[PDB]
């Protein structure tokens, strides 16, 4: 299952191409400006077979709870209403979000103790690195 | 989770566009001829959180065991070696198979007591209906 190494609290330490990724999602300028400035915190916990990923920032907080491979409704930070599925590939935690015929993916994997989130939307790619606290 | 209504033994009663689907997978003629003639039987069982789908025919038998949303290695009836994931969407059991940069999906759902499998490969679509025994 999901490695317990994911469990814990994660602090953003780097972000690459987040602006263009947001633009591709349809996020407006003023919103992107605050989205880029946000030094977020991601918290991953588990109770039974149910995994929770909570994102905390000044601007917006989010939280999703899910079982692996079981679709669920999500309200994203920019307030898209998606049908989302989280799966496990080579230890990589892969979230896909579908809405209005569109699709984006957020892949989270552990690299040398850091969590590396890679976001993909229409060939636009961003990378965000977190370190555990 | 996966509805217990899937559990049981299923007999093929109809198949539509299976030939073109096989062609799209790269299946050769003589193999397709036996693949089309095959009156298969699908058996779905569960032990804990692990689901097993066994396909039985004279020509070829197959069997896969998996957890929802967790990638696993599969050897298909035509002997492709794929990385596969099974997920749950609106009660639909969705298998995706990836190999050599390619992708195909087999979606299984229950309709009025029948199991309806829809296979997709490069816009080629097939439908196979099963009734429970
Ligand atoms: C601090 C959160 C973003 C606030 C601004 C809204 C931007 C909309 C896009 C939301 C999806 C962001 C996904 C980031 C993935 C991650 O690093 O966990
Ligand atoms: C009786 C099985 C097929 C035998 C011939 C090999 C054809 C290769 C394609 C294998 C995938 C078939 C998927 C069918 C889905 C189903 O109805 O469960």
Residue numbers in the entry:
A (entry chain A), B (entry chain A): -1 to 131
Task: Quote from the publication.
Proline 38 lies at a putative hinge between the barrel and the lid, and the P38G mutation would intuitively be expected to make the hinge more flexible, perhaps aiding lid opening motions or making the portal region less stable. The crystal structure of P2-P38G indicates that the overall structure of P2 in the crystal state does not change due to the point mutation from an amino acid with the most rigid (Pro) to the one with the most flexible (Gly) backbone. The fatty acid palmitate is bound in the same mode in both forms of P2, and the flexible loops at both ends of the barrel are also in similar conformations. The helical lid is also closed in the mutant protein in the crystal state. wtP2 and P2-P38G have indistinguishable folding in solution as well, as shown by CD spectroscopy. The melting curves for both proteins have similar trends: complete unfolding happens slowly between 310 and 350 K, the melting temperature being 331 K for wtP2 and 325 K for P2-P38G. This difference of 6 K in temperature stability is also likely to be reflected in the respective dynamics of wtP2 and P2-P38G, indirectly suggesting a more dynamic nature for the mutant protein. Taking all the structural and functional characterisation together, P2-P38G is functional, and it is also stably folded in the crystal state and in solution, like the wild-type protein. The point mutation P38G in the hinge between the barrel and lid of P2 does not affect P2 folding or render it inactive, but it increases the total flexibility of the protein. The increased membrane binding activity of P2-P38G could be explained by increasing protein flexibility and an enhanced ability to interact with lipids.
